[PDB]
Write a protein that binds this ligand. Structure first.
Ligand SMILES: [Mg+2]
Ligand SMILES: [Mg+2]
Ligand SMILES: [Mg+2]
Ligand SMILES: [Mg+2]
Ligand SMILES: [Mg+2]
Ligand SMILES: [Mg+2]
Ligand SMILES: [Mg+2]
Ligand SMILES: [Mg+2]
Ligand SMILES: [Mg+2]
Ligand SMILES: [Mg+2]
Ligand SMILES: [Mg+2]
Ligand SMILES: [Mg+2]
Ligand SMILES: [Mg+2]
Ligand SMILES: [Mg+2]
Ligand SMILES: [Mg+2]
Ligand SMILES: [Mg+2]
Ligand SMILES: [Mg+2]
Ligand SMILES: [Mg+2]
Ligand SMILES: [Mg+2]
Ligand SMILES: [Mg+2]
Ligand SMILES: [Mg+2]
Ligand SMILES: [Mg+2]
Ligand SMILES: [Mg+2]
Ligand SMILES: [Mg+2]
Ligand SMILES: [Mg+2]
Ligand SMILES: [Mg+2]
Ligand SMILES: [Mg+2]
Ligand SMILES: [Mg+2]
Ligand SMILES: [Mg+2]
Ligand SMILES: [Mg+2]
Lengths: 208, 177, 132, 343, 328
RNA sequence: UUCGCCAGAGUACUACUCGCAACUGCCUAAAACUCAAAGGACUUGGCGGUGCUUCACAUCCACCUAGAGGAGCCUGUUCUAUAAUCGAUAAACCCCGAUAGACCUUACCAACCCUUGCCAAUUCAGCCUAUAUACCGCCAUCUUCAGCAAACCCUAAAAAGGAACAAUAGUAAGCACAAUCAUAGCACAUAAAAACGUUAGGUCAAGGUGUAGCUUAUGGGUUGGAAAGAAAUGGGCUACA
């Protein structure tokens, strides 16, 4: 709240500024952006101009952090990506010439595909009608869908692992499972979809 | 209005016509009374709530040297004088109504307040006006630009002659001794 | 509702002085302190020894000048000598004013073992700042 | 133990408890007295219980041209001074315990009919010294406010008059009784009626008026019949200047409506001069005592018509069973012919 | 109250002469700023509200504008709009409408004669002209005003300005115009300095969360950062702390083209990195042209961080976390 | 111009009569006894599980995070138990008076001593005796709600209300809000402020106190003790990895 309503959100993209002359529709916005005497917020410490960082990676690291220990969560991402990489490399080196053209070695792509596979399509909202709560199926927003996909995996890896099992190793298992659509988070998703299909007839209770 | 029956000549296909015989008979007394107050150093105020000619009313009043009120009439203007205008003020000795009705088509505040404060009121009353409280009513037309300009010019010259003849009367008073 | 050092608003006829018209949350903002000394500083001492004398001076002057005290005392403390600035109504004759000022300037000095100055400012009446 | 003492103002503020939490809504008034005494009333500064005489406070500075030293009164002189300061307290208590009395208007514990004094002068400088006012009605009206609940406003209906025929009435309402009295006095002058009084003692003609729900019948009365009217109409007519009148009120006896109807009827009178003007005929009074003598009261100024009025063999008048009973002597009620006090 | 103000005038003048005598300055050259300094020295009242300080100004500055006498000794008011409540406001409105009608008649005659010699003077954007607020109209028209009446007056001024303007009415409207300052928020660029046989030298200051940082930048050296006498890798073992350091350099493509020494005091591990980031951004302005400074400030490198720790409040836990509130 | 009714309310579209194809019925229709009221319309608050618009920004849901209620400990209450304080005890009490209990603190109790007994004096001192439902001083609450309110004016009477901006009776000092000030540059934010009143809200035990009560005692000193938890609960700390 220390930032007033006049303060606007900063822009981190370098390519946005490096080529101003190639377009006029976007040329017409940034000159007014600074000619309107508009103040700009300070850039957050978590977001930088790195080419190796992803907003999805940063969000998933933020969601794992317990308390305020950010370095521990950053580490846990380090070993999670490293373990996914090394397990995929061990699988890479044990196959025949045909499978190396299909097996992916990129942890970022594997993580993004796992999140897309874990992303639900429809959600449920409790609606009170006649003194009882009915689970009405409702379309979810993109941010809600991705938040559910992320939270389901984090919750599953937090509780359904053995005490000797470490978080990066368990997450490396479930990432490869969710990439191929064989993980328990996919089962949770399909459970929500089935419970929405069973109450499809109750969707008329929604008024929006 | 129910009280305009004696002040009308008849009805020309729905539109009522005001006879000008009693209009002129009333206007003679109206102008005489207006001129006498100005002659005897009286405050004369033109009250008129009509958003078409208000500028003309302030121009006429400024040329006459009298006062005007054509804007929104406040509540305790004439009654609560020691508060709205100043600690001790002089109430207007005569009120001229060019439009007895406001924009709501209700009787004006000043016609009631002048009767409350015993202030003479001379007024141009239309067929929808109420002349019961106006001391000197003149049945006429207040919506025609020529009619209102005629009335404004008549009341301008009535004040001008009164003031000038007061000045020559004082000039002869000085030569009396 | 806060009620400390606050005179409540009447129907609109009470005369209130500048000191009483301001709530305690205005001290050092709109009005100043009635007493000045060094004991309330950071690395200084002997605050209570001066505070007890301050309270005793308030009460003693209130009793010494009965009904003619306009505002509260201003107690200045500067190099072993304490000055008392008072606002007094012109109810007593100057002969009785001069008896009491000379009485206090020696009684207080002999009771506190320190020089005491007494300065009186005579006002025709209590000066009113807010509504009256 | 000296630092435990406070200021006399703070002591009294707690002693009287004028700002108590129970006295706000109205739970108080059980012991309806709040007296605060100033202890510094007759306290000379220099005097003390030891009887010391100080040259600056008690005794003058110089005597016989020489300076006075500190003295002390003798035991008996100090006792004489003590007796004086004690007897001052009995004198002040004698002044305090006596109540200044007040004229009763209609009863010993009502505000109706009491004198309130001349009203306050106007802003331009007009002073109403000949005017007199009397309280007609007092009422503790209550309103329902969200926070305080019962809001008590004293409302008074008050009429003013000078005795020369000009009188009026108005209502003043305020939180305080004194403020309501002042408001009524200052607002009654602005609404003044003029009452046409025939020969300055009685009304011109009998008036039978019908107000909202109050019927008033007033009959013209002789010189020897002084104000046998209602107890409020008598006060109003005493303020107006009417000395001889008889009035009977029937139906509702509401004070506000009674005053409004009385003033409306007294203002709607018809003068003999206006009757002569409107009928173009001479107004001739036939006194019972003066026999058949044609006493002329008003002359029809202007054109005097020679055509006489249609003589009605049988008059079509609006009679009343009350006055018919009075004329036929059937009024056997014991409440009509009693002996009452004078005006 | 006119005579009271007149006496205050002479009292203020004699006080000004005596104040000049006290200070020993020339009373002829003694001005209001000198009065302010003299009062601030003689009467050093330490109060947080500046209006409570002792002030000695001109009586027409201290006292508000007083209404003049509205009527003569015969009782007749001077102005013809006295009985309207607001004689000054309604006179202003009447004059504005009279000039509007005059302009309308003149333009009608010019159009009848087929003469178009007027121009559009309504657009005063390069001057930064604005309309008077209710306070600026209330200091002119001494009597109190209303918001709706002020809006009516402004809307009438717009109608007047939307018509072909002559000579006098433009000047009449110009007194109801206020000029704004340049809201240009461009920063001051520190000039490139040369110190002791060293080229491409500059300095920067940053502060974030009680951490003060000074950065000394050389544009002629290789890419390295020396923090408090030790290397940046040793001082910031965390990857994010070094990402903060690379954030200003990578944006301007000056990674290996500048040699920098950072000295930071206070704060924690990330507060020092943020302060060094801000100082480095403020220092790299000199080595770049103007079009990239705006890109950088729009990326957020040149704006400080006012996100500071809030003070704990009594009765609460962490200045927001309240105690366990039991309903029953 | 007429006809039929109306004499406080409850008793009472009742009992007893007459008449009637009606036999749990219809019409006419009292009295004993009880009260000083019973009634009609209206003004303003308050309320509405009436209805319609704009909302909730830590706030109701939709939704996010960390916890309580489960265990141990600390501590505060309600209960039993003792010779053994008191007050708070719905939001607005429960690590609250108390930023603080071995004697002191301590006002509680049991044993013992002194009674013009702190002060210059006082048929005087002294009382933590009762009344917070007499108070002042200090606060909680609605409450980051905006209203309160002196002097006036108006209403075909007035309990009360007072507004139409192309304006239809409203001016209005002042207290609030707002503004300003502090967190040492602005902005934001925080802090602070929040009037009149509601809860007869808390405090005679910070201190003084009106009233009613003690004076070889309900006053003043010394010593020793003020446990313990069958059990219930509130708030925190430690964790359950
Ligand atoms: Mg008309
Ligand atoms: Mg009696
Ligand atoms: Mg009666
Ligand atoms: Mg915390
Ligand atoms: Mg009966
Ligand atoms: Mg029936
Ligand atoms: Mg029956
Ligand atoms: Mg919540
Ligand atoms: Mg915990
Ligand atoms: Mg537990
Ligand atoms: Mg207890
Ligand atoms: Mg209790
Ligand atoms: Mg409670
Ligand atoms: Mg003991
Ligand atoms: Mg103990
Ligand atoms: Mg005791
Ligand atoms: Mg209480
Ligand atoms: Mg407001
Ligand atoms: Mg009213
Ligand atoms: Mg006001
Ligand atoms: Mg500041
Ligand atoms: Mg602000
Ligand atoms: Mg606060
Ligand atoms: Mg404020
Ligand atoms: Mg209570
Ligand atoms: Mg209690
Ligand atoms: Mg006590
Ligand atoms: Mg007690
Ligand atoms: Mg417990
Ligand atoms: Mg707590």
């Amino acid at each position: 709240s220390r930032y007033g309503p006049e303060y606007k959100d900063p822009q981190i993209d370098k390519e946005y500024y490096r080529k101003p002359l190639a377009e006029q529709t976007e040329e017409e916005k940034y000159e007014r952006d600074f000619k309107k005497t508009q103040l700009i917020k300070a850039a957050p410490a978590t977001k930088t101009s790195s080419v190796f960082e992803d907003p999805v990676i940063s969000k998933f690291t933020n969601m794992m952090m317990k308390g305020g220990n950010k370095v521990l969560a950053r580490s846990l991402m380090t070993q999670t990506l490293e373990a996914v990489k090394r397990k995929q490399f061990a699988k890479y080196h044990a196959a025949s010439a045909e499978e190396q053209a299909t097996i992916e070695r990129n942890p970022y792509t594997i993580f993004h595909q796992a999140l897309k596979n874990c992303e639900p399509v429809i959600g449920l909202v409790p609606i009170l009608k006649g003194g009882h709560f009915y689970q009405v199926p409702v379309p979810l927003a993109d941010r809600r869908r991705r938040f559910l996909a992320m939270k389901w995996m984090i919750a599953e890896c937090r509780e359904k692992k053995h005490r000797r099992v470490l978080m990066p190793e368990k997450l490396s298992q479930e990432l490869l499972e969710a990439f191929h659509n064989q993980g328990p988070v996919i089962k949770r998703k399909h459970d929500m979809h089935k419970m929405a299909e069973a109450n499809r007839a109750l969707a008329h209770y929604r008024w929006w | 209005h129910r009280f305009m029956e004696p002040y009308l000549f008849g009805s020309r296909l729905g539109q009522d016509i005001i006879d000008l015989e009693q209009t002129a008979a009333h206007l003679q007394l109206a102008l005489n009374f207006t001129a006498h107050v100005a002659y005897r150093e009286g405050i004369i105020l033109f009250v008129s709530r009509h958003r078409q000619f208000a500028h003309l009313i302030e121009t006429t009043a400024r040329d006459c040297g009298e006062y005007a009120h054509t804007r929104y009439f406040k509540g305790g203007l004439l009654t609560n004088a020691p508060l709205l205008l100043g600690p001790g003020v002089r109430l207007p000795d005569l009120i001229i109504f060019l439009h007895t009705l406001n924009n709501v088509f209700e009787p004006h505040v000043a016609v009631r307040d002048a009767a409350k404060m015993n202030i003479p009121t001379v007024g141009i009353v239309d067929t929808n006006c109420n002349p019961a409280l106006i001391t000197y009513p003149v049945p006429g037309n207040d919506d025609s630009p020529p009619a209102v300009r005629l009335f404004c010019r008549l009341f301008q010259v009535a004040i001008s002659r009164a003031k000038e003849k007061r000045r020559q009367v004082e000039a002869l008073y000085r030569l009396q001794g | 509702k806060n009620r400390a050092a606050r005179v409540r608003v009447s129907k609109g006829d009470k005369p209130v002085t500048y000191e009483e018209a301001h709530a305690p949350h205005y001290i050092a903002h709109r009005k100043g302190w009635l007493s000045l000394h060094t004991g309330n500083l950071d690395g200084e001492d002997h605050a209570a020894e001066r505070t007890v004398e301050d309270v005793f001076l308030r009460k003693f002057m209130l009793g010494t000048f009965p009904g003619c005290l306009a505002d509260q005392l201003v107690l200045k403390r500067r190099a072993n000598q304490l000055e008392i600035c008072a606002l007094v109504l012109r109810q007593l004759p100057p002969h009785k004013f001069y008896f009491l000022v000379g009485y206090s300037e020696t009684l207080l000095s002999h009771f506190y073992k320190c020089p005491v100055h007494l300065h009186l400012q005579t006002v025709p009446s209590k000066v009113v700042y807010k509504y009256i | 133990s000296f630092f435990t003492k406070l200021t006399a103002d703070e002591l009294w503020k707690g002693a009287l408890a004028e700002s108590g939490a129970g006295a706000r809504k109205g739970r108080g008034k059980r012991t309806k007295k709040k007296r605060r005494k100033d202890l510094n009333r007759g306290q000379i500064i220099g005097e003390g219980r030891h009887g010391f005489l100080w040259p600056g406070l008690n005794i003058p500075l110089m005597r016989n041209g020489a300076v006075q030293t500190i003295a002390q009164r003798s035991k008996e002189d100090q006792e004489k001074v003590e007796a004086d300061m004690v007897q001052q307290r009995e004198e002040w208590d004698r002044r305090r315990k006596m109540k200044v009395k007040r004229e009763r208007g209609w009863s010993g514990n009502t505000w109706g009919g009491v004198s309130l004094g001349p009203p306050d002068p106007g802003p331009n400088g007009e002073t109403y010294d000949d005017f007199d006012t009397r309280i007609l009605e007092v009422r503790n009206v209550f309103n329902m406010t969200a926070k305080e609940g019962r809001k008590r406003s004293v409302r008074v209906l008050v009429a003013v008059g000078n005795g020369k025929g000009a009188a009026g009435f108005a209502i003043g309402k305020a939180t305080e009784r004194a403020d309501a009295f002042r408001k009524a006095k200052n607002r009654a002058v602005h609404y003044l009626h003029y009452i046409e009084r025939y020969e300055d003692h009685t009304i011109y003609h009998d008036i039978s008026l019908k107000f909202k729900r109050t019927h008033i019948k007033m009959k013209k009365q002789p010189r020897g019949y002084g104000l046998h009217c209602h107890r409020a109409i008598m006060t109003i007519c005493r303020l107006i200047g009417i000395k001889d009148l008889y009035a009977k009120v029937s139906g509702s006896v509401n004070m506000l409506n009674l005053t409004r109807g009385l003033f409306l009827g007294l203002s709607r009178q018809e003068t003999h001069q206006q009757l002569a003007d409107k009928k173009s005929l001479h107004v001739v009074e036939f006194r019972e005592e003066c026999g058949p003598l044609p006493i002329v009261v008003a002359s029809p100024q202007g054109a005097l018509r020679k055509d006489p009025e249609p003589e009605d063999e049988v008059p079509d008048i609006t009679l009343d069973w009350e006055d018919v009973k009075a004329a036929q002597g059937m009024k056997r009620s014991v409440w009509s012919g009693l002996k009452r006090a004078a005006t | 109250t006119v005579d009271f103000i007149k006496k205050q005038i002479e009292e203020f003048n004699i006080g000004k002469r005596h104040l000049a005598n006290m200070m020993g300055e020339d009373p002829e050259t003694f001005t209001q700023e000198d009065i302010d300094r003299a009062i601030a020295y003689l009467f050093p009242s330490g109060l947080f509200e500046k209006r409570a300080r002792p002030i000695m100004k001109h009586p027409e500055e201290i006292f508000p504008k007083q209404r003049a006498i509205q009527w003569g000794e015969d009782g007749r008011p001077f102005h013809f709009l006295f009985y309207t409540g607001k004689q000054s406001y309604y006179s202003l409105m009447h004059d504005t409408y009279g000039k509007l009608l005059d302009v309308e008649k003149h333009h009608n005659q010019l159009r009848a004669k087929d003469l178009l010699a007027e121009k559009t003077k309504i657009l005063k954007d390069p001057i930064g002209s604005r309309w008077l607020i209710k306070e600026e109209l209330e200091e002119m028209l001494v009597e109190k005003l209303s918001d709706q009446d002020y809006a009516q007056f402004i809307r009438l001024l717009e109608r007047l300005s939307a018509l072909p303007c002559g000579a006098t009415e433009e000047d009449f409207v110009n007194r109801f115009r206020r000029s704004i300052p340049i809201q240009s928020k461009k920063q001051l660029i520190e000039p490139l300095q040369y110190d002791e046989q060293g080229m491409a030298f500059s300095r920067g200051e940053g502060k974030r969360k009680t951490a003060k940082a000074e950065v000394v930048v050389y544009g002629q050296g290789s890419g390295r950062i020396d923090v408090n006498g030790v290397d940046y890798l040793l001082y910031f073992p965390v990857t994010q702390d070094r990402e903060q350091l690379m954030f200003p350099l990578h944006f301007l493509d000056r990674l290996g083209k500048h040699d920098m020494t950072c000295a930071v005091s206070g704060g924690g591990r990330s507060a020092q990195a943020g302060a060094v980031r801000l100082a480095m951004a403020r220092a790299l302005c000199s080595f770049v042209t103007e079009d990239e400074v705006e890109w950088m400030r729009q990326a957020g490198l040149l704006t400080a961080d006012p996100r500071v720790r809030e003070r704990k409040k009594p009765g609460q836990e962490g200045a927001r976390r309240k105690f366990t509130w039991k309903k029953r």
